[PDB]
Design a protein around this ligand. Structure first.
Ligand SMILES: CC[C@@H]1C[C@]1(NC(=O)[C@@H]1C[C@@H]2CN1C(=O)[C@H](C(C)(C)C)NC(=O)OCC(C)(C)CCCCc1cccc3c1CN(C3)C(=O)O2)C(=O)NS(=O)(=O)C1CC1
Ligand SMILES: [Zn+2]
Length: 201
């Protein structure tokens, strides 16, 4: 537009729930409904308590996951773009933005818990989805892993930004894209945790 006075601003990313991994059962919890989400995206002021490692996040148009690792809440650029995140004190600007890696990060919210980067060098992995499914994945390269049991891409949609974990529960990567044939995901592409660690320097 040429009329700057009426140009709009995009809202903030808003935390609307979490994937609870604290007990013996993984389950999704919603912490904010759609009306409250819309309001919070506009103001960027979110006073809700944050807990856990894996957050469910939303914009006005999309919903996906974000994962705390080393004191940074990470997600995908294809979901968040350059948006701020809502926080108790107002919008918080990204501390990391890398379109080439499809990676963004903000300082981790107070109350969150961070995963530790994996140093195990192990190839037996576990992908956590927005529905709290824990999907076994065999690592197949730096940024790929195969599903032991393939799934329609519908099952994975909305889980970009979520973690791949090793057997000990360390972060191995951030889910980025599905490797799909005829709508069936046989594998996943992820941003390796080492790439996050390099971004942090
Ligand atoms: C459905 C579950 C998927 C996790 C998910 N992500 C996606 O939907 C991403 C977003 C977009 C497309 N895509 C794919 O997964 C596609 C697909 C299945 C849609 C057909 N696969 C593909 O292109 O494989 C090709 C392959 C060669 C394997 C790509 C590897 C390179 C990957 C790569 C490297 C560097 C930069 C970029 C990329 C890809 N990238 C930018 C980018 O923007 O990708 C999601 O759930 N998104 S979401 O619904 O949460 C959304 C709201 C956030
Ligand atoms: Zn590990």
């Amino acid at each position: 537009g040429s009329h700057m006075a009426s140009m709009k601003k995009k809202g903030s990313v808003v935390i609307v729930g979490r994937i609870n991994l604290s007990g013996d059962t993984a389950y999704a919890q919603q912490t904010r409904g759609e009306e409250g989400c819309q309001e919070t995206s506009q103001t960027g002021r979110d006073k809700n308590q944050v807990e856990g490692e894996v957050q469910i996040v939303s914009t006005a148009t999309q919903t996906f996951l974000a994962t705390s690792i080393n004191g940074v809440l990470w997600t995908v650029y294809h979901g968040a773009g350059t948006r701020t995140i809502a926080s108790p004190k107002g919008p918080v600007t990204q501390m990391y933005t890398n379109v080439d890696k499809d990676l963004v990060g903000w300082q981790a919210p107070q109350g969150s818990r961070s995963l530790t980067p994996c140093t195990c060098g192990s190839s037996d992995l576990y992908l956590v989805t927005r529905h709290a499914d824990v999907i076994p994945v065999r690592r197949r390269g730096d940024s790929r892993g195969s599903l032991l049991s393939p799934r329609p891409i519908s099952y994975l949609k909305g889980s970009a930004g979520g973690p791949l974990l090793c057997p000990a529960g360390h972060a191995v990567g951030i889910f980025r894209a599905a490797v799909s044939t005829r709508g069936v995901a046989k594998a996943v592409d992820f941003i390796p945790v080492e790439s996050l660690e390099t971004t942090m320097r």
